[PDB]
Write a protein that binds this ligand. Structure first.
Ligand SMILES: Cc1cc(C(=O)NS(=O)(=O)c2ccc(N[C@H](CCN(C)C)CSc3ccccc3)c([N+](=O)[O-])c2)ccc1-c1cccc2c(CCCOc3cccc4ccccc34)c(C(=O)O)nn12
Ligand SMILES: Cc1cc(C(=O)NS(=O)(=O)c2ccc(N[C@H](CCN(C)C)CSc3ccccc3)c([N+](=O)[O-])c2)ccc1-c1cccc2c(CCCOc3cccc4ccccc34)c(C(=O)O)nn12
Lengths: 141, 141
């Protein structure tokens, strides 16, 4: 049973569950379904208690795998069980959801700032000279 | 009439129109509507002619505003008019849509790889030792 496949399924489920998209988007099924459901229950039961720690944690272009690995090792210090495996997937899903949110906001804000800068320096004088945006509406509404 | 407010509106409209999302998301109004509509028609008429350039250009954490400005200055070399202003908004919206798409894929696939790595190194031996994922389903599904 492929672990990479689980990861990919769980992450898309969580992204989707939280309302994320950036595109218009049997035995193996049974594992996925139970993992999704266990991740859901774990989050309902523990998100408050997990929340104080999973607040600021947001991965950036530079974050190293080793940092991730050092942090995750804490969860498994007293050994591996299914509960802790589920916590791991949920932690991953929450990391992923949090990073995407921040990174996307930063990216779109930068481009918005670029456009506003260009408008102000190069285009606003013309707009004022040619009737403002009301003339645009009149002409092209 | 605020130019920044236009930018923010146009970008949100374009992101939404393309099915982008992270998070669960009269005077001024008329300009926005006319800009949205003009941007839409511009894209329907010229997306093929643009498409050559629309495709590969994707902004990264390091892209400099000056590069953006040098490229956009070409659109306005022969002077400013409404049509070129609309083209500018659509260009910005296409840049934004394309960058978000790529950066999100990169981010999510990096976190997926991290999780898959951690599973394989630290957890897979235990999983195999304790009945595989079918035992997880029996126990917690
Ligand atoms: C991980 C865990 C496991 C169990 C457990 O109960 N494990 S279980 O008995 O195996 C089991 C039982 C039931 C089910 N499922 C049922 C579903 C039945 N439904 C079909 C009805 C219930 S839903 C459910 C319930 C529980 C688990 C799964 C699903 C399953 N399951 O599905 O796998 C398994 C209980 C509590 C905790 C737990 C929660 C929060 C923190 C924490 C720590 C702190 C150290 C980490 O440091 C960090 C601290 C803070 C932040 C960090 C961030 C990152 C890294 C480390 C961090 C430790 C620890 O000390 O390790 N433990 N926790
Ligand atoms: C910009 C443009 C404007 C018009 C125009 O027609 N302008 S218009 O007459 O003012 C007008 C008419 C109608 C409306 N609207 C109606 C809506 C009516 N509905 C109410 C029914 C029609 S929809 C509509 C239609 C048109 C515009 C808007 C909306 C409006 N309008 O709304 O604003 C205004 C026609 C064609 C083009 C045009 C298209 C594609 C490429 C290109 C270039 C190459 C750049 C080379 O530089 C670079 C070189 C190299 C690399 C580069 C990289 C990046 C940039 C530039 C680069 C140049 C150029 O070289 O300039 N021009 N183009």
């Amino acid at each position: 049973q492929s672990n990479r496949e689980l990861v990919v399924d769980f992450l898309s489920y969580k992204l989707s569950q939280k309302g994320y998209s950036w595109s218009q988007f049997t035995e193996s099924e049974a594992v996925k379904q139970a993992l999704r459901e266990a991740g859901d229950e774990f989050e309902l039961r523990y998100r408050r208690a997990f929340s104080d720690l999973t607040s600021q944690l947001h991965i950036t272009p530079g974050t190293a795998y080793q940092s991730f690995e050092q942090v995750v090792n804490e969860l498994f210090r007293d050994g591996v069980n299914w509960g802790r495996i589920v916590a791991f997937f949920s932690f991953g899903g929450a990391l992923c959801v949090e990073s995407v949110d921040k990174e996307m906001q930063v990216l779109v804000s930068r481009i918005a700032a670029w456009m506003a800068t260009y408008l102000n320096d190069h285009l606003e004088p013309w707009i004022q000279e040619n009737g403002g945006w009301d003339t645009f509406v009149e002409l092209y509404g």
